[PDB]
């Protein structure tokens, strides 16, 4: 039905890239 | 400290003359192509999007139940003597079936008789436009019995034992589905189960439900609920004039001079609830026929 | 009538110390030999108070933590808060069960005022602790002679009145009035000024009761001799005394960053009021009532207010301010930090800030040629040329001829930095020998000492006759030093390359020219001498006279000469020409004799090659002074003396038509007049001392600047910077860093600025239009409070766009901190397009589900309705409350990531002002981690489960993110050009309007 979204999987992949996107600007602040 | 009225070097409220025209005149220019450029997305946007289907539909899942008489707080309170009492009633319910006369619905080249009997679900072809503008079946005003409109009793539906019509939400391509054998709440109400969406109507206590005397459901042929024959919806741009199902009840043995509530609640398996909203499926309505 | 008391403690003092012994014995009642009876002690020290400065004032820990609490950015706030609380009674006393936005952000406002007042406050107590873990101030007892017996006591027991014997060494306990002295030489260095130790003589010498000898000061130590005195002045009834009291009782002033924040503020509300009336008008003119229009006016005004930019700012300051720790350039006020950027002209102290204050040997005069001595605090200077002989016979007469030598803990402590007991010239002498020619401790013990001959006030010589050293054979060593002109008269041999040769007035007068050039030079010359005595004329044994001089006198071999004077610190001149190079007008203002001043300024940078005075070019014409015109003198020596018969006017004259000014012998109390006169031009001075001179100098100046360990503790207190390293060119890192934080404060002002526009047009075309709120408060709280916190903090760390050590320092009146280019260009450009974009993502989600932009005109009536579940959308289809307002709070997170999406390009064209993004470059690594953090949360603000439930931030379908993009690249696009423009045409719109 088309009366349906896939909520989670993009609820997923949000989170996901949220916690790549802060690690990685960690890496960048934390130099080495 | 408030004198930038004037200067010596022409100023006017901070700065020259010459000066307020170019500032001006880049914001105007400015702005134009700002505004320019909104509307130049905003057209691309409107490019994207369909005429005969919403790209989302999501946020509409379980479809509402409202009523005619839209109440400030979905109560109805008045006085079975005063005329007055009862007016913004009445006005809102004639109003609303004012297209279902049948002098509104008499051109046969957008109106079909579907029948007296709830029959399966009609499907006109697709969506698109392939098609030219789809057909709506008829609902005359006589189905909802007792509580019909301006036929023979122009009631209003109050001189005690008022009326209250319900009416599903008018979804886009939905096609009701009402329940089947795990049957935990379908009440015996109407033998007529499998083309008609059931809404059965309740108190919402031991003491509301003990107030509420009986109740009269009107519909198509005799059961309450809604005829499959009338979905799914087409859109407004390729169907026009369309008139969904209603579904009368009656609350004859009320308790004068009390108010009690009453939850309407349509069952069925494309049917959702939600405890954050009240009308999500089901329907509710404070009653007190004070005299 | 304390408006008085001020002025009292502004003149001058004056004395009563030409008295004689049986006057003076008189006006006190003490006997001039056995001082009081002990009995009469404790009829003076319980009558006025213990001789001890009464404590400054103390000012408890809850002051502070108020003073930060009300402030002047935090009114604003907390005006915000108190419209809050008063817009939401409004709310509540008119509709049935309200919503709790309005507390919310009342609370919010409360706290955000609260933590910065925490921070601050926390921030400026560490600098106290640490202020407090240096000064550790012990007792120092005096030596009193009671009922006729010696009994040392603590300080504050002193009386007034009582006879006190000063030794070599200790300090000197209150002002004292000199009855007999044998040489004594008090360090008037923290009080008057004084480089040279001036010696205290009993005889009244001076009007002056600081130029007398006969009176010794509260604060100065006994360098050499000893001394006895009656007290005459104890406690806070000194002469330090008052000055310090008088630094206690001055104002602080307005700092210039303050009044910056203040003008920032003023036009804030300028804007959020003028927005707030001209809505309030248009509100009640389309169709909302009075009651609603109120509530409006006060949203419009409240909504325009930046709240997170208090913690930015905050934080913006302590970042420097913290890089200025590290480097010892310690503040103790939080915005002084940039103080030291906005100054054109520093007044400084020349003995302790810019000279050591250490008598140091500068040049020596050997084989009739100048040899000039490294003058360097860390010994990193020229090395003098030392192969010959006769520097090796000027080394023994010096390094032999000296009465003592340095102290029993001075062991580890460096050769400069250690204490020496005896005169200030000989503890040059030993430091000279000491890192030049080996060790003094065996040099001076293998020539075994005999007979020696101190200082004689008729027939002044100073000698000395030693043993002979290793197998030479001549068995005798008679050493002499002391003044050039008298040394140079008792000697006959003179000793050149290694070799004797006789006293021909050819080489003679090649001494004298020496001895006028090194004088002229600003230093103290003495001369050497040494004679060997012939043992076959002269026994080798015991053989030896003290009554009736038996030693030649005369006939002695002339070494060469010795001259000395404190030196300036190392990056002192280096410090002094980079302040001239950003336009800084550096001014000296000390208490020494104009003689060592002009050539400490000649020698420093405060008077260049070339520049004559009023007195310079008279001497070069052989005409009299009278006669020149001032106009032709560029630079002047302004005498403390004629300073006192000096009006306001003539200061002005004297500062204005003079670039290189030298103010000598200055009292503490002049400095205070030369600072206000220097303030009367409207310039932002600074004051670098180390005295309790300097203290008064130091307070009333836009920023002090006090030495770490060569500043007494008063001026050290009344100042507003300390340098604990003592290094003068924290001076020029200080100026560095406050022209960066001001540049770098207009950046982070203009970025949470420009997220103004933006926030507030959601809820104003909202009104307007009468549409579905576009954007809620919460979402706006994420963004001045959440997401762009990093980024308004990171632009802290920008680096410098061209060499600001090179541009003249800013006008107050002229350059201001946000002036009305930067509103021109957040508020008129870039945060129009900002809007825009956020816009375009509103009509973007509710078009795509199922209301179109045209259908949402007048669909607030009933979007806001929680009855009207039947509300049409331009297909038909139904909706209810709850499933509509799901679209509203879907629709109001991505205007909120929407913004995040334009800050990008914001932060990006706000990093750079002039120059290209790509000419400075993004190395900013705090920036780049503001930008992945600013993203990252706004993600997670979004898709954390449960957030349409706490927050009502639902999640967002992908393909919003990229609804910004474009006006995102547009407004990096527009910036770029706009400052590329500007880059290549610095003439006059692209100029004067946008640059801001
Ligand atoms: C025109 C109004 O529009 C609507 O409200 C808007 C305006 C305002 O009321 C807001 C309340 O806080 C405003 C606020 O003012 C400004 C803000 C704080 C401002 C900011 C400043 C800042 O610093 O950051 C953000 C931006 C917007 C803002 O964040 C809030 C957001 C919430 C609002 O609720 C939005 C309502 O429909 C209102 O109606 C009713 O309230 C209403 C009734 C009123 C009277 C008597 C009977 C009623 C019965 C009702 C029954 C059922 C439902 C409503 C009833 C209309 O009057
Ligand atoms: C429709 O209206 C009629 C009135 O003409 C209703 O008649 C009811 O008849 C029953 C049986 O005698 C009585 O108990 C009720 O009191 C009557 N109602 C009224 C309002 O008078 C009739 O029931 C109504 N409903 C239907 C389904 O016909
Ligand atoms: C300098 C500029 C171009 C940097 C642009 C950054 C782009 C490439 C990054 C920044 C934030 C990112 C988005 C972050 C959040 C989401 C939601 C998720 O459910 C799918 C991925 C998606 C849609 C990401 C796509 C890539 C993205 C848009
Ligand atoms: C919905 C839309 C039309 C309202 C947007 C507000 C616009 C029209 C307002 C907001 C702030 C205003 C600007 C504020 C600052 C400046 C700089 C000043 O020296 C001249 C006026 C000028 C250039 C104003 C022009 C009008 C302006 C840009
Ligand atoms: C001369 C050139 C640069 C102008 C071209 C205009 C471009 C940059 C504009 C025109 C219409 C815009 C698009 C309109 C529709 C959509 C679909 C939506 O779900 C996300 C935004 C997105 C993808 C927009 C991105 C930017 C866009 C493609
Ligand atoms: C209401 O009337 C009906 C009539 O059939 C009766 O059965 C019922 O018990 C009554 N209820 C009340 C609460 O009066
Ligand atoms: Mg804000
Ligand atoms: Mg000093
Ligand atoms: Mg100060």
């Given amino acids: 039905d088309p009366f349906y979204y896939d909520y989670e999987t993009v609820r997923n992949g949000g989170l996901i890239f949220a916690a790549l996107a802060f690690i990685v600007g960690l890496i960048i602040i934390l130099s080495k | ?291 | 009538k304390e408006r008085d008391m001020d002025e009292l403690k502004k003149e001058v003092s004056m004395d009563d110390h030409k008295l004689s012994l049986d006057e003076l014995h008189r006006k006190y009642g003490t006997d001039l030999s056995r001082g009081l009876t002990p009995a009469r002690a404790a009829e003076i020290l319980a009558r006025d108070g213990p001789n001890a400065l009464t404590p400054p004032p103390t000012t408890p820990e809850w002051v502070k933590f108020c003073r930060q609490l009300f402030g002047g950015f935090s009114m604003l706030l907390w005006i915000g808060a108190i419209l809050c609380f008063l817009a939401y009674g409004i709310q509540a006393a008119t509709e049935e069960e309200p919503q709790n936005d309005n507390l919310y952000l009342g609370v919010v406002l409360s706290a955000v005022v609260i933590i910065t007042g925490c921070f601050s406050y926390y921030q400026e107590a560490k600098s106290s602790k640490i202020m407090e873990s240096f000064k550790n101030m012990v007792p120092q007892q005096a030596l009193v002679i009671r009922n006729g017996e010696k009994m040392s006591i603590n300080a504050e027991e002193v009386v007034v009145g009582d006879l006190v014997e000063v030794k070599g060494g200790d300090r000197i306990p209150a002002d004292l009035r000199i009855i007999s002295a044998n040489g004594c030489k008090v360090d008037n260095s923290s009080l008057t000024g004084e480089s040279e130790p001036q010696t205290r003589s009993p005889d009244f010498t001076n009007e002056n009761p600081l130029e007398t000898r006969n009176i010794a000061f509260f604060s100065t130590n006994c360098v050499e001799g000893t001394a006895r005195g009656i007290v005459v002045y104890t406690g806070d009834r000194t002469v330090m005394g008052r000055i310090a009291t008088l630094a206690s009782g001055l104002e602080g002033g307005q700092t210039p960053i303050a009044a910056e924040i203040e003008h920032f503020i003023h036009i804030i509300t300028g804007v959020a009021v003028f927005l707030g009336v001209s809505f309030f008008i248009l509100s009640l003119i389309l169709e909302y009532t009075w009651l609603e229009a109120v509530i409006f006016l006060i949203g419009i005004i409240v909504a325009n207010v930046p709240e997170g930019l208090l913690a930015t700012v905050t934080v913006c300051l302590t970042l420097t301010a913290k890089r200025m720790a590290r480097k010892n350039c310690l503040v103790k006020n939080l915005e002084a930090v940039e103080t030291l950027g906005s100054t054109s002209t520093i007044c400084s102290d020349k003995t302790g800030t810019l000279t050591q204050n250490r008598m140091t040997v500068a040049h020596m005069w050997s084989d009739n040629q100048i040899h000039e001595a490294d003058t360097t605090e860390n010994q990193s200077g020229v090395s003098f040329d030392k192969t010959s002989a006769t520097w090796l016979a000027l080394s023994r007469i010096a390094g032999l001829c000296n009465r003592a030598v340095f102290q029993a803990n001075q062991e580890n402590l460096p050769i400069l930095k250690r204490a020496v007991a005896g005169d200030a010239s000989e503890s040059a002498l030993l430091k000279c020998i000491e890192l030049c020619c080996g060790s003094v401790k065996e040099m001076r013990e293998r020539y075994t000492k005999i007979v020696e001959i101190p200082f004689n006030s008729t027939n002044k010589y100073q000698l000395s006759i030693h043993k002979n050293p290793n197998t030479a054979e001549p068995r005798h060593l008679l050493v002499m030093k002391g003044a050039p002109e008298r040394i140079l008269d008792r000697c006959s041999s003179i000793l050149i390359h290694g070799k004797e040769q006789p006293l021909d007035e050819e080489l003679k007068d090649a001494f004298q020219n020496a001895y006028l050039e090194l004088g002229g030079l600003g230093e103290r010359v003495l001369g050497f001498c040494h004679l060997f005595l012939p043992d076959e004329q002269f026994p080798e044994g015991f053989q030896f006279d003290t009554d009736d001089v038996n030693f030649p006198l005369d006939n002695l071999c002339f070494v060469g000469l010795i001259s000395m004077i404190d030196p300036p610190r190392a990056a002192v001149p280096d410090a002094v020409g980079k302040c001239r190079s950003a336009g800084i007008k550096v001014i000296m203002v000390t208490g020494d004799h104009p003689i060592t001043a002009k050539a400490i300024a000649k020698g420093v940078g405060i008077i260049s090659e070339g520049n004559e005075t009023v007195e310079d070019i008279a001497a070069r014409l052989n005409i009299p002074v009278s006669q020149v015109n001032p106009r032709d003198a560029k630079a002047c020596v302004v005498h403390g003396s004629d300073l006192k018969d000096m009006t306001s006017e003539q200061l002005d004259d004297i500062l204005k038509y003079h670039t290189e000014i030298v103010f000598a012998r200055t009292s503490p109390q002049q400095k205070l007049i030369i600072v206000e006169g220097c303030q009367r031009q409207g310039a932002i001075v600074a004051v670098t001392g180390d005295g309790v001179n300097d203290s008064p100098a130091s307070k009333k100046a836009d920023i002090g600047v006090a030495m770490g360990i060569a500043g007494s503790d008063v001026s050290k207190q009344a100042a507003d910077m300390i340098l604990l390293d003592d290094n003068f060119a924290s001076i020029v890192t200080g100026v560095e860093e406050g022209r960066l934080i001001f540049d770098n404060l207009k950046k982070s002002i203009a970025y949470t600025l420009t997220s103004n526009i933006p926030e507030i047009t959601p809820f104003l075309i909202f009104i307007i239009a009468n549409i579905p709120l576009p954007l809620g408060t919460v979402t706006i709280l994420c963004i001045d409070l959440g997401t762009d916190m990093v980024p308004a903090i990171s632009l802290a760390y920008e680096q410098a766009e061209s060499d600001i050590m090179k541009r003249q320092p800013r006008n107050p009146k002229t350059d201001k901190l946000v002036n009305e280019q930067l509103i021109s260009m957040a508020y008129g450009q870039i945060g129009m397009i900002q809007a825009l974009g956020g816009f375009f993502t509103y009509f973007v989600i509710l078009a795509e589900n199922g209301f179109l932009p045209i259908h949402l005109l007048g669909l607030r009536v009933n979007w806001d309705d929680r009855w009207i579940n039947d509300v049409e959308d331009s297909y038909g289809q139904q909706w209810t409350y709850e499933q509509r307002k799901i679209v509203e709070f879907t629709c109001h997170t991505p205007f909120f990531v929407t913004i995040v999406v334009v800050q990008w390009a914001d932060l990006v064209i706000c990093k750079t002002r002039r120059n290209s993004v790509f000419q400075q470059g993004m190395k900013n690594k705090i920036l780049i981690f503001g930008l992945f953090e600013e993203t990252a949360l706004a993600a997670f603000l979004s898709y954390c489960p449960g957030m349409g439930v706490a927050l009502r931030m639902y999640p967002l379908k992908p393909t919003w993110w990229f609804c910004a993009f474009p006006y995102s690249l547009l407004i990096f696009v527009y910036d770029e050009v706009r400052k590329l423009i500007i880059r290549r045409r610095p003439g006059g719109w692209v100029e004067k309007e946008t640059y801001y």
């Fill in chain 2, 1 to 291: 400290k408030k004198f930038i009225w004037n200067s010596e070097k022409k100023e006017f409220l901070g700065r020259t003359g010459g000066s307020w025209f170019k500032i001006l005149l880049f914001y105007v220019i400015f702005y134009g192509c700002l505004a320019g450029i909104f509307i130049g997305t905003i057209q691309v946007m409107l490019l994207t999007i369909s005429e005969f289907k919403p790209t989302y539909q999501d946020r509409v899942a379980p479809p509402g139940l409202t009523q005619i008489p839209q109440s400030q707080k979905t109560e109805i309170s008045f006085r079975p003597n005063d005329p007055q009492s009862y007016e913004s009633y009445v006005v809102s319910i004639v109003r609303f079936l004012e297209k279902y006369k049948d002098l509104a619905q008499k051109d046969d080249m957008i109106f079909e008789d579907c029948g007296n009997v709830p029959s399966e679900l009609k499907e006109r072809g697709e969506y698109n436009n392939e098609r030219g503008e789809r057909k709506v079946c008829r609902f005359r005003l006589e189905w909802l019995g007792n509580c019909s409109g301006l036929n023979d009793e122009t009631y209003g539906y109050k001189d005690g034992k008022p009326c209250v019509i319900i009416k599903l939400n008018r979804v886009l391509g939905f096609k009701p589905k009402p329940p089947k054998n795990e049957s935990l709440e379908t009440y015996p109400v109407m033998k007529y189960n499998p083309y008609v969406l059931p809404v059965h109507c309740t108190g919402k206590r031991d003491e509301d439900k003990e107030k509420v005397g009986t109740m009269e459901y009107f519909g198509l042929g005799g059961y309450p609920g809604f005829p499959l024959q009338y979905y799914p919806y087409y859109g407004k741009l390729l169907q026009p004039k369309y008139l969904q199902p209603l579904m009368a009840v009656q609350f004859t043995n009320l308790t004068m001079d009390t108010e009690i509530r009453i939850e309407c609640k349509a069952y069925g398996e494309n049917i959702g609830y939600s405890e954050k909203d009240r009308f999500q499926g089901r329907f509710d309505v404070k009653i007190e026929v004070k005299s």
